[PDB]
Amino acid sequence: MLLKNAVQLICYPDRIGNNLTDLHTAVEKHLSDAIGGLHILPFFPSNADGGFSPLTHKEVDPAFGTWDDIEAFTGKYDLCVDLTVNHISDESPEFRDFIANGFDSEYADLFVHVDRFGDISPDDMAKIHIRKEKEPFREVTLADGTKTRVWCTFTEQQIDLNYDGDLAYRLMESYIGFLTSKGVNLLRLDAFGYTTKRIGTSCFLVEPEVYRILDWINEVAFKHGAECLPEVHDHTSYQYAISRRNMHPYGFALPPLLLYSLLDANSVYLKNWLRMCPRNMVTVLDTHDGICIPDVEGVLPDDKIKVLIDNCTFYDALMQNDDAYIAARAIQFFTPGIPQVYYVGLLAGCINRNYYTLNEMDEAMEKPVVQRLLTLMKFRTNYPAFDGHFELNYSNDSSVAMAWRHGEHYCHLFVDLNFNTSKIQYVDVKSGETRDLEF
Template identity: 40%
Template sequence: MAIKNQVQLITYPDSLGGDLKSLHKVLEEYFLGIFKGGIHILPPFPSSGDRGFAPLTYLEIEPGFGDWKDIRRIGEKHDILLDLMVNHISAKSAYFQDFLKYGRKSEYADLFIPVDKIWADGNPTPEEVEKIFLRRIEPFSSFIIEETGVTEKVWTTFGKVTPSEQIDLDINSQATRQLLADFLTNFSRNNVRIVRLDAIGYVIKKRGTTCFFVEPEIYQFLDWIGELATSLNIEILPEVHAHYLTQFKLAEQGHWIYDFILPYRILETLINKNSVRLKEYLKNRPAKQFTMLDCHDGVPVKPDLNDLYESEDARKVVDLCLERGGNLSLILSPKHRDADGFDVHQIRGTYYSLLDSNDDAYLAARAIQFFAPGIPQVYYVGLLAGENDQKGAEISGDGREINRQNFSLEEIEQGLKKDVVQRLLKLIRFRNEYAAFNGEFKVINSEHDEVRLEWKKDKKYCRLIINFQNYQSMIEYIDENGEEVTYLV
């Protein structure tokens, strides 16, 4: 199966209308023919937290969202993309609950990673733990086994509480590989065509290493799961937040990757009215990427852009985003901060609000995203030019909720009346339908306060020209009559 070179939508299962049936209705009534690239439905499975990212299983759909029939129905007209958290599963899952009851006697015991699987005596040295790329204060959690009273220390990369609610899986175990195969087989039966391998950078646990993106083992696992997915007519998309060179290694291996650099590059270009860094990046980046501006988390900074920014410049961008109502996710580990203390992991806020709710600046950002080689994804809040949900962030205590508001059908209808939304829909249609986007891409030399990007195929071409002084964007292209036409975005 080939991934379509057209625009995709990213949405939670309940964010556009309330559930999967409403999502289907919204796609049919309001966005018919808009998302020809597919629909990325953020985890619709039963989950114990993290808005779906602590799944209990992938064999069921959370009843409040609907069922697999609803997924299949959406999949009749759209390629469906779902997440598979290959690194971990919920502590509330039947698998881990059985382990909590019976310990090593559990039929699921081999799914997990007691510390003595890596260190025979169960005691890693402080130096070995220090070397591990941490997401928590320490990578382990202790649990008391009900039947025996024995304390088991198991690997838990993620989770905000101790003991963690997300338990790491042992991908070297035959039991885990069979479980992953069962999940992927179920996806295939239900019209799922693309699977994002979430947190895949953490799956290899190897003594004496960082336990993050361990080579060559990471490629061996990707080869295994890639072959399995191909046999099920599924494409895989590894998701790795790391130094950009790590991403580029995946691209060199032929994998799809995420362009986590582009959102910040575009943001700083529009804020500083200077396109020098953006143009340099667009000339040298891998082409086989999924692109985005916004998502359910935030605009990535560290570690994705390490060595690609000066912290003094980044602080100015961050401070302006804070003035515009955004908030920050910070790097917790001191050893991963910059020498001068800069520690911004992600800038959180709707992309529209981060651009000061300026319609022209927002459309310029989308135009650059759509012209950058790759598969463009549009997050549902960005689709409706949503603004920062300060109340949601305050009530929940989670800064990410600033960009996670749900829209009722009435609110969707109101959003569609906005001029900026109609202009965006027109731009999406152009990106979906113009043939030159399957041709050759070029960054045309231009002044530092503008950008010129071009696609050519046979006798067709389209050229994007943006003036960053006034954010005016126009596209020159050859229409079906062979005439050159100018389209003001």
């Protein structure tokens, strides 16, 4: 549908070269026919958390470039961008206005006021699903000298939005409209699970509230020509729930699943997942965040997870073994969904966030393992069979056999996990013969 069924690049704005212009130089020079889109990590004005505390989604942080540097991509490549639906910076225009004007501010109902709930019992606090070990409450000093408390799931420079009120949905629709006008196809919804706040609950993925919030955003997105990629790290059950509301789940189960598969030469759990895997997902191997274990619970039994845990750029977990890494990307790419490749993974780097100069990328492109990866990326991005249907094939319990078919076009992946071998056969339509991809 709306998006190109092609490889996407996950990248920062400023870590290949220095800015979006240098980024655009790198894509055109090397990746012009290997990717059909980019996920550019947060590139708005921000004041904490590596970019996830945006003052607004309506500005490019001038450090990275300008909206014209963004639109240079949005005529040839899909564009995936983060939408921080849970929270906005305390330095945002809206929150500074609440600080100035107190509860008389017209943006007051945009934030969550801990005082509405009343006294929250210990039992209700114990239900809250949060990683930090402080109460998720920031007490702020207003202009008048009063002290009120707002909900704060993350760092204190991040103020959560109020989805029992109305302003939060207007603010998001404004962001989505403007972002989509700039050429953004795909909205990665960051920390969507925390948008549901209800005392007595987990305040995380509270059902079915979470899906009504999620349905509303998707419709706003669809009116403006964009699809959604709701990102949550929890039981895969939420990935199928996302998938079944016409949104893109993450294939967060795949990376740890392949690590186990390759390290222990076992395809039983991988094949079972491919037979089940939620569809219309965006697949990753290495992210901008790293290793997440709860995403593979149930997909991989607890004993095999322990094996995996007992035995981080994705390349390092395979012990910098090129054959293993190439086979994992091969498997990822034939997995149903849109494959993302993180930029450090493209350059076979060695904590998960490195800087490259434009010379350093050209050098890294010369690496044998990287040329093998370009060959896959071009093939996955261009060969028409991937636009057809997935048919998994019978294999023994130490190998994986994956195929795609779209009319005449047919290609077949075979990975022997015992020897990390990658073999792709595809149909050259023009000659009608069966050919071996050289990678």
